[PDB]
Amino acid sequence: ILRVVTEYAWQKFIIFYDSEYDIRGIQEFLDKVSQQGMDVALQKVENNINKMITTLFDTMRIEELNRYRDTLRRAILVMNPATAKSFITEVVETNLVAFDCHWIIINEEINDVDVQELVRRSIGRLTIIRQTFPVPQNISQRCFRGNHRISSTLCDPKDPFAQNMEISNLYIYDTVLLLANAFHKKLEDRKWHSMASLSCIRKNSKPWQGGRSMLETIKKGGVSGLTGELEFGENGGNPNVHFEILGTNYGGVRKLGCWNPVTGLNGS
Amino acid sequence: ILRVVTEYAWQKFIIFYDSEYDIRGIQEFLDKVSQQGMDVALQKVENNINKMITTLFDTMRIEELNRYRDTLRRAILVMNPATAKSFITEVVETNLVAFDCHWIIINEEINDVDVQELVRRSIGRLTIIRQTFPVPQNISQRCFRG
Ligand SMILES: [Ca+2]
Ligand SMILES: [Ca+2]
User: Fold this and answer.
1) In the 8-state DSSP scheme, what is residue A100?
2) Does B35 lie at the interface with A, CB-CB under 8 angstroms?
3) Between A93, A98, A123, which is nearest B120 by CB?
4) Which of A16, A260, B37, B110 would staple B130 via disulfide (CB 3.0–4.6 Å)?
5) If phi over 0 gives left and psi between -120 and 50 gives alpha, with beta otherwise, what is residue A190?
6) Distance from C-alpha of A79 to C-alpha of A110, rounded to nearest angstrom
7) What Rg, from alpha-carbon coordinates, does chain B have?
């Protein structure tokens, strides 16, 4: 979000977040914008937008709303798409934004149906930032990885399930996939160590003697799945991630660029 | 509608009407705009807007839609408010109109709830023309006549 904001040369904008978001996620962002001397407002968006905005007009006086309108010309939404949809509509309909506004929505999880609906509801420039998964061309090969066949319900992107999957769902698939390959290699190499029946609340209880070798095998595993490549670095965490950046100035959405943490930003 | 159009100095605009409207109602209007040399398009709006506009983008090519977009900058809606609501939203969301547009809605019957909702849905200038009834001040005397 910092990189994108920097590219647009924003100096003044408002960050909107939903009622479940943990703002520690942007503590580093807030530090940096302050360090660069920007004017950044924060507001939590209640889950019922209708009473929020109605309350606003009543509560706030004219000169405040004029200040508020100006502030909304540049905004970042850090919220789930459902709340964002409702929020965008209500501000638009109540004339709190206009054609010159530019809003950014950022969330790993925004599906194609959500993106289309957000664009439909917005009336200025909109930028959408979401995580994307490297998936093959030729729709037929989308449902295979080598000889491994994936249920069409997960890989057919015309499928309602597929279009409604949570990101965690994709990772769950690849996790099962990764484990299977880990077990396979361990079995094939004839270096199997059996599972053990363990006991928890027993300060005497011992750990699984097989755990260290299994962990090492899984940790050094890698598979191609629905998320792209799943694998682990030396620190035990998946390093692979990709973000796409979508846009539309109104008057329809297109790809502006891509981001990943090694190469950085590509495109405008 | 003629008087209002004359006041705004329109020279080119499109008239949209719903599927129940009897266009003989505007035959005299059409005569007069033609006599003044205006460029006036007519289209019936089907009762399901969603398939109408979807059909449109598929059916029509680019250069037609550009012609069409330009034409929609000035429009008159001669339809019931329910159909107008849906119609305004769908054109707005599909970027067939923009901030510079000016639309007129005319119907004797458009209640206060409809008016508020139309304004909410529109994104340019909107003019609403409806019949009104002279009703007393002091809400108490509204419910009496003598
Ligand atoms: Ca739109
Ligand atoms: Ca409006």
Assistant:
1) T
2) no
3) A93
4) B110
5) left
6) 10
7) 17
- What is the DSSP pairing of strand B12-18 with strand B39-45? parallel
Structural method? X-ray
Task: Give the resolution value in Å.
Answer: 3.1
Q: Does the beta carbon of B121 lie under 8 angstroms from any beta carbon of chain A?
A: yes
Q: Return the amino acid letter for A49.
A: I
Pick the closest to residue A260 from A169, A162, A129, A166 (CA basis): A129
| CA A260/CA B2 separation, integer angstroms | 59
Query: How many whole angstroms from its chain centre is CA A76?
Result: 14
Nearest to B90 by CA among B120, B125, B128, B51: B51
Which of B98, B120, B121 minimises the CB distance to A251? B98
Beta strands in A64-133 (DSSP E): 74-78, 102-106, 125-131
Q: How many CB atoms lie within 10 A of CB A95?
A: 11
CA nearest to B98 within chain A = A251
Contact A214, A193 (CB under 8 A): yes
Rounded to an integer, what distance in angstroms lies between the CA atom of residue B7 and that of residue A216?
81
Q: Please answer whether residues A121 and A86 qualify as being in contact, where contact means their C-beta atoms are separated by less than 8 angstroms.
A: no
For the CA atoms of B62, B64, B69, B73, what is the dihedral angle to 10 degrees? 160
